[PDB]
Amino acid sequence: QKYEKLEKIGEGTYGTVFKAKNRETHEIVALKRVRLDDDDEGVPSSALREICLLKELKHKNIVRLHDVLHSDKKLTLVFEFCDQDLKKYFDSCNGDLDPEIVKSFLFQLLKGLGFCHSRNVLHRDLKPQNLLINRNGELKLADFGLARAFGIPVRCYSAEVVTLWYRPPDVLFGAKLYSTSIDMWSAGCIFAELANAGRPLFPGNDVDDQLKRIFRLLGTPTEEQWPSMTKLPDYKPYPMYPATTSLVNVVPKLNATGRDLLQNLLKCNPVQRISAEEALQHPYFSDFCP
Amino acid sequence: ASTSELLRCLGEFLCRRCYRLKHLSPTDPVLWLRSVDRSLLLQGWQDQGFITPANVVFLYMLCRDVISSEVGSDHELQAVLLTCLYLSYSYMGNEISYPLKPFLVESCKEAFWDRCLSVINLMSSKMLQINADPHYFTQVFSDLKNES
Ligand SMILES: CN1CCC([C@@](C)(O)c2ccc3cnc(Nc4ccc(-n5cccn5)cc4F)cc3n2)CC1
Numbered sequence: 001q002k003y004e005k006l007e008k009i010g011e012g013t014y015g016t017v018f019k020a021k022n023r024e025t026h027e028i029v030a031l032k033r034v035r036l037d038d039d040d041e042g043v044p045s046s047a048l049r050e051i052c053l054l055k056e057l058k059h060k061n062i063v064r065l066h067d068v069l070h071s072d073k074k075l076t077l078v079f080e081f082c083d084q085d086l087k088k089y090f091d092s093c094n095g096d097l098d099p100e101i102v103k104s105f106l107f108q109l110l111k112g113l114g115f116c117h118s119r120n121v122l123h124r125d126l127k128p129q130n131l132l133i134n135r136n137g138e139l140k141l142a143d144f145g146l147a148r149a150f151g152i153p154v155r156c157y158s159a160e161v162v163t164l165w166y167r168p169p170d171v172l173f174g175a176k177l178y179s180t181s182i183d184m185w186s187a188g189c190i191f192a193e194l195a196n197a198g199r200p201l202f203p204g205n206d207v208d209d210q211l212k213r214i215f216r217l218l219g220t221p222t223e224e225q226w227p228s229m230t231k232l233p234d235y236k237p238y239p240m241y242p243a244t245t246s247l248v249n250v251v252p253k254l255n256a257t258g259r260d261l262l263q264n265l266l267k268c269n270p271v272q273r274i275s276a277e278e279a280l281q282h283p284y285f286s287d288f289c290p
Numbered sequence: 291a292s293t294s295e296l297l298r299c300l301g302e303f304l305c306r307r308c309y310r311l312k313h314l315s316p317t318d319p320v321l322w323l324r325s326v327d328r329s330l331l332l333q334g335w336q337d338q339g340f341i342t343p344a345n346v347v348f349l350y351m352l353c354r355d356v357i358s359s360e361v362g363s364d365h366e367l368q369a370v371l372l373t374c375l376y377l378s379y380s381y382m383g384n385e386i387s388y389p390l391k392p393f394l395v396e397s398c399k400e401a402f403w404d405r406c407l408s409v410i411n412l413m414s415s416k417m418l419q420i421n422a423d424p425h426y427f428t429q430v431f432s433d434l435k436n437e438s
Contacts, residue, residue: 036403039394042335042387045380048406052381055414068410070403120422146386149421152344158384 001071003031003078013043014145019081029066030082034075047075050144053121061112063132063142082132082140086190089133095198099253102194105131105139106261107285109187112141114276117180120151124161126186128193150179162186164210165200169221169268172211174234181270184279188265195251195258211238217250218266219243226269257284296346296434297323303350303437304371308361322368323349326375326392336385340378347427349378350434351420356409368395373405381417 003020009030010017020031034047054065067078084092086105097105109131116123123130125146132140146161156176161167168185171178192201201217204210215221220240221229229235247259254262261284264274274282283289301316308314327339352374361367376393396402420427 036390036399039390042385042389044390045376045383045387048377048380048410051407052377052410052414052417055410056418068407070400070407073399075403120418149381149418151421151424152348152382152427154342154344154384155338156384158386160386 028081030079032077036075037073046145053144053147057119059112059115061108061140062115063140083135084133086128086131086133090198097194102253104137105194106191108139110276110279113183113187114280117276120149121147122150123147123183126183126190127163127166164204165202169211169214170270172207173232175232178270181273184265184273188262191262191265192251195253215241217245221268255290257289291343293341293343296343299434299437300346300350307357307359308367309359310362311364314364319371322371323375329392335388340383345378345382347431347434348382348420349374351416351430352413355413373409377409
């Protein structure tokens with residue numbers, strides 16, 4: 001009634017998403033309709049979590065929630081409109097980015113991510129589909145349906161977080177607790193996609209295959225590098241793959257400086273993973289970078 | 291430090307706040323909260339119970355700011371407490387999602403959803419702050435313990 005639906009954008013368990021027009025102000029927005037009629041499933045629960053977090057996460061690189069309407073047996077989340085996600089962008093441009101678009105996209109992601117972490121929020125669902133891209137070059141971190149506030153000590157968080165391909169080795173090994181490090185691993189994985197041909201670096205079939213693909217490229221963490229690794233709940237012995245394997249052909253669009261930032265994001269030991277704030281201070285982002 | 295001890299403080303808090311409710315018992319809120327936790331566990335919506343010392347503290351934080359002294363029936367108190375609990379599950383719970391059915395005690399579903407949105411508008415900022423600010427967590431924890 002307040003919004004004219006223009007066209008569908010997508011739909012899943014999350015809900016149906018439309019490009020819409022404010023009938024009053026004629027502004028273009030994105031609408032997520034969330035059905036409240038199925039009392040016997042938990043879809044609304046996750047939407048209200050996203051609403052609580054996004055009300056407190058106002059940054060140019062986090063998707064802006066403008067309003068929440070309750071009409072009929074439905075909830076309507078009104079977001080800013082974005083032209084596409086990074087998944088459609090990769091298909092649009094043959095998975096081929098100019099090195100400066102690689103740099104611009106990672107930069108905006110780290111700023112949005114750094115904002116979340118400083119506000120005590122974990123995203124926990126970084127993947128190209130959750131990065132919104134505007135034609136003017138803007139990127140926004142989206143989809144806080146899996147996000148959570150942290151700071152109160154707890155026995156554990158869920159290990160059913162992040163889709164397999166962007167999940168870090170500590171969580172694959174079933175770690176009870178993780179920090180902001182969880183998102184920085186996902187950021188590394190996405191950086192690798194930007195800097196090659198838009199294809200996932202670690203496309204595992206399952207947890208076992210996922211760890212093998214990570215260790216096969218980065219080398220298997222030693223007791224010296226990661227002393228608590230063997231104590232993790234779902235730890236099992238993996239082959240010792242060498243740490244000598246070159247990253248040049250994995251990210252051909254990156255020079256040594258980019259490759260150094262990628263290795264600081266893809267540290268297996270979560271405690272050694274660079275923070276968003278440190279990453280933004282990296283030479284890869286200085287004016288003096290070749 | 292015990293869940294029972296802190297659920298008893300919350301119950302005694304609600305009996306003192308809701309002065310119009312002459313036949314409300316401090317165990318009635320505890321029975322309503324435990325009933326939900328058990329039900330979700332037995333229907334395999336969760337591996338472990340949600341009701342822990344920290345989560346009871348978080349629930350009290352919402353209750354003390356949301357629950358009017360002028361609540362007019364035990365039924366109405368149950369509906370508002372289960373609204374604050376649903377939001378507690380939804381914000382602090384380890385499962386991705388939780389069903390509505392165990393938290394709905396009203397025939398008017400529109401009234402339940404408007405109160406969800408109303409509480410989030412009031413409390414979204416403090417919901418993040420109790421996590422982000424350990425000093426604030428301690429204040430709330432102390433305040434709940436001083437309700438007996
Ligand atoms: C997976 N997860 C689902 C929830 C979604 C949501 C509801 O939080 C959200 C919020 C604001 C949004 C603003 N803008 C757009 N625009 C947009 C995007 C993609 C395409 N596209 C991909 C292929 C083909 N087309 C087209 C478009 F117009 C989506 C938004 N989604 C974020 C992502």
